[model samples]
Target chain A: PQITLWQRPLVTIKIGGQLREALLDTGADDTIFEEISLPGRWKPKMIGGIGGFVKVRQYDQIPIEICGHKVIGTVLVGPTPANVIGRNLMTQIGCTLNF
Target chain B: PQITLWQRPLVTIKIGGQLREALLDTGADDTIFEEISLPGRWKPKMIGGIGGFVKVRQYDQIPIEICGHKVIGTVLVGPTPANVIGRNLMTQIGCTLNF
Candidate 1:
């Protein structure tokens, strides 16, 4: 599928049975959400970005639908500025950069 | 041409007769460089991102070659974490988000 780059790379995603919007951040290494409720326990870890590192709850093998493409992988939940779909998850959907 | 999405989507670009690497950020609204000297005067403006806002010098009609594509438009020079090619410049190169 082809997506148009908007003011922000905002995309619709379905996670844990809930629909949400997230930023496609190729700049980041891990997929992160501002805050979310999910089942089971997760490990506490830190992730860094443009600013610095922040604590996050890492859950593995989570099923998420990004732009209608279903993928199961790791997802981090924490106090993020925005929900971001990083390169980790982007690869599962075969995202490529073209000009 | 096709470019693979790297861990950071870093791409080679030529700006103001200098070659440099920049991140292709769909999440950013304006293109920003890390304090580069360009010709003529510029208007001081502020741009916000995941963290906050920062003062930048806006130069119009600047020639920038990204991924071998020549683009002439506004390029903001400022104190950024890294050189970022934003939506403003991405569109000029006919960049599309595909998976």
Candidate 2:
């Protein structure tokens, strides 16, 4: 059965629609944007984040197949990094971080 | 442009369907489920919060005509409060509290 993931510090993720790696912050509650931009197909919704409430949304939840592991999670849209992995996805499946 | 509000501690908001008091904690950053059940119109989407990532969604963004003041912010769906007003709505519009 699929289990949940947890961690401190940061984990890296491949920026959607690109092949770049960025930090995944468990302390962060929402997926944030870095310098890159996002597709408009994902409508912007209002949700709270670290800098305080900002407009955000979920773009997709395609099976995240990472490092030969698979887990289904919703892809949240945001402005920039300070990108966070958030507890939402972490608790859904167990994870391990590599330096 | 709409001005922003600032604060510490909690502010009270009337839960959607009921006339009751709930603390609006700006520190909380997200609206939590609390004990009372939420209306079905508000769907759940997953995002990060103090307790970590949880499923949540913005149910509505209505003109909160409160205290003879009008502001537009999104109402998020969740399990329970501890009910937080979150930065999303709070910052987009400004607010004040009374003792």
Candidate 3:
């Protein structure tokens, strides 16, 4: 898929038997989602964004289907404004930027 | 320039006669930079990020040279984790995402 930067790049992501929307955030280093729950063991973590730092629960090796590609990586559950698919998962799906 | 997602897609940007680094953030709605000052009267605004909302100074129609491409757009000055070049300016440079 080729996404032009004229609008926000959002895609449907399936995780834990639920479909959610997420942004392909090149500026973010870690993938995170809000208002969702998963069945796994998680650890407490803190991360910083454009505003400030927030505490989140980190779940590792979680299976998720982004668009149509199935991938397993780390996901952070937190209180974010939106679901963000960061570089961690983007690299696994061979996403790139071109100009 | 073609950038792989294995690393952060950071580029050197020239804004307000200074060289700075910024990420091409497709997830962000506006461009923002910290630790820098711009010459003009700006209005106070608040925007949300992964964490929450933050107050910033909005400077409009600022001339910024991003990766040698001349572009003029709105820029917010605030305490972001890193300088971000949002879709507002990414579209001017014809940046796109490919998977």
Candidate 4:
């Protein structure tokens, strides 16, 4: 599927058996979520963004189904304005930027 | 150009008579540059992101050459980790996300 830039490149993702909307951000290096509950333990980490750095809980080896493609990666739980699916996860799902 | 998610989707942009590298961010709503010199008066504005919000100088109707395609829109100058070309400018260049 081709997603235009006119609107937010949002896609439905299934994580932890729950469905939610997240932005497909080519700009973000790391994937972060505002709030979510996971089973495994997470480590304290920091991630940088356009504004500044924020502390996040790093949950590694998490399985998420993006657009029906199942993939696993590190997901950060933090105070982001929106839930973002970054390059880390996008690479696993074979997402790309086309012009 | 077809850009894969294997690396950062960095692109060359001509703005303010200078060539600079910026990330082609589909997830970003507005374009923001860390530091750049632009002519004209700008208004102070704030934009939210992953961590928190930051103050920026908003310049409207600013002309920029993105990959040789000329377009005009609002650009923000502020303390960002990197220069970013957001969806606002991406739409002008007809950038899209594909899988």
Higher-lDDT candidate of 1 and 3? 3
The 10 consecutive residues of candidate 4 chain A with the worst lDDT sum are A46-55
Please provide, for model 1 over B1-99, each residue's C-alpha lDDT reduced to its tens digit, 9 standing for 90 to 100: 665665678889888888889988777778889977799889998876544467889999999988778989899998777898888888888787788
DockQ of 1: 0.54
Error of 2 at A17 (Å): 5.2
Q: Better model by DockQ, 2 or 4?
A: 4
Candidate with best lDDT: 3
lDDT of 3 at A77: 94
Better structure of 1 and 3 per TM-score = 3
Candidate 1 lDDT (Cα, 0 to 1): 0.82
DockQ of each: 0.54, 0.02, 0.84, 0.85
Model 1 stretches with alpha carbons more than 4 Å out = A51-53
Per-residue C-alpha lDDT of model 3 across residues B1-99, encoded as one tens digit per residue: 999988889999999988999988999879989978799799999998866789999999999998789999999998777899999999998999999
Q: List the candidate 3 regions with Cα displacement exceeding 4 Å.
A: none
Model 4, span B1-99: residue lDDT tens:
899988899989888997889999888889989898999999999998766789999999999998889999999999988899988899998888999
What ranking of all candidate models by TM-score puts the best one first? 3, 4, 1, 2
- Which stretch of 10 consecutive residues in model 4 chain B shows the poorest summed lDDT? B47-56
Model 4 spans > 4 angstroms off: none
